[PDB]
Design a protein around this nucleic acid. Structure first.
Lengths: 205, 73
DNA sequence: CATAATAATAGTTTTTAGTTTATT
DNA sequence: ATAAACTAAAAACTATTATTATGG
């Protein structure tokens, strides 16, 4: 938890009482965050702030689109997953205010974050794992703009160990996440073979 | 996806409160027993009667009622 | 201390080691 | 002195049911 942020929160409340990129120092902080060099102390300060300040800059989040994503990408405090999930929740709390389909920078940031999360998505727990799955479903069905499916990490996730004990079902539920989308069931692009890609499916079947 | 952050925080269970969750379910169940008892005892009573006419207030009876208002009762 | 739960237990047929009763 | 049955066959194949690892 953050505790020195409370005066920052009071600042946010006061400015929003007083309150395009009309500067109330969010140009200064805009530069202070856009650089992927900002120290993790200051980086996390700004992160928790903008989490608490998502409301003020709604018809501004598009300019904030690139920082958060590059802030989101390769996050390295209370826990990496913590801030990752919190910030992506903030990002998707708006949908039409900004979309990561403009400059290819936000597009590749979104794809890389997708790879990060699908690498990270697992719980020994029941719902919070399924909560992450629903997070993936929500993001993919709220953007559907530049989103592309790897199928490879996915394949090894669902092809699994040929499970005599259920483990690769994580990949199966990932496939279901894809299935909820009108996205292709599996792009018959190179992949690995595009034929056995379903033989592994029927094998675990 | 506006409650998505609220969905996150409501699903922030990683302080390992499984026993706490089951106990909360227990307390909810007990309150459900109480409320269900109350509801059963209430509903055995005659349900609220339904009306069939609009009504207006004045110094005189308003004859302007319609045939429907007359014959539905 | 509640509930789509779930699964480790059990119970049917086989075929061994107990034994009569003459057998010499 | 038991050559037939002495006496009850110790045992899995192939099928089900209450457990809870958990769901909440």
């Amino acid at each position: 938890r953050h505790e020195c942020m409370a005066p920052l929160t009071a600042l946010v409340k006061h400015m929003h009482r007083s309150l395009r990129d009309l500067p109330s120092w969010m140009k200064f902080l805009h530069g202070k965050l856009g650089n992927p060099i900002v120290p993790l102390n200051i980086r996390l300060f700004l992160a928790k702030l903008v989490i608490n300040t998502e409301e003020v800059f709604r018809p501004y989040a598009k300019h904030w689109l690139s920082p958060l994503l590059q802030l989101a990408a390769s996050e390295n405090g209370e826990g990496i997953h913590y801030m990752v999930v919190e910030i992506v929740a903030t990002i998707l709390s708006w949908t039409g205010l900004a979309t990561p389909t403009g400059v290819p920078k936000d597009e590749v940031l979104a794809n890389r974050l997708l790879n990060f999360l699908m690498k990270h998505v697992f719980h020994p727990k029941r719902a919070v794992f399924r909560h992450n799955l629903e997070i993936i479903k929500t993001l993919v069905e709220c953007w559907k703009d530049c989103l592309s499916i790897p199928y490879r990490l996915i394949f090894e996730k669902f092809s699994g160990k040929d499970p005599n004990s259920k483990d690769n079902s994580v990949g199966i539920q990932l496939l279901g996440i894809v299935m909820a989308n009108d996205l292709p069931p599996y792009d018959p692009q190179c992949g690995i073979q595009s034929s056995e890609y379903f033989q592994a499916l029927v094998n675990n079947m | 996806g506006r409650t998505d952050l609220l969905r996150l925080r409501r699903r922030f269970m990683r302080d390992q409160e499984k026993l706490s969750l089951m106990y909360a379910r227990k307390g909810v169940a007990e309150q459900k027993r109480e409320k269900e008892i109350k509801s059963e005892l209430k509903m055995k009573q005659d349900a609220q009667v339904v009306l069939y006419r609009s009504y207006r207030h004045g110094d005189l009876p308003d004859i302007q009622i319609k045939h429907s208002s007359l014959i539905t009762p």
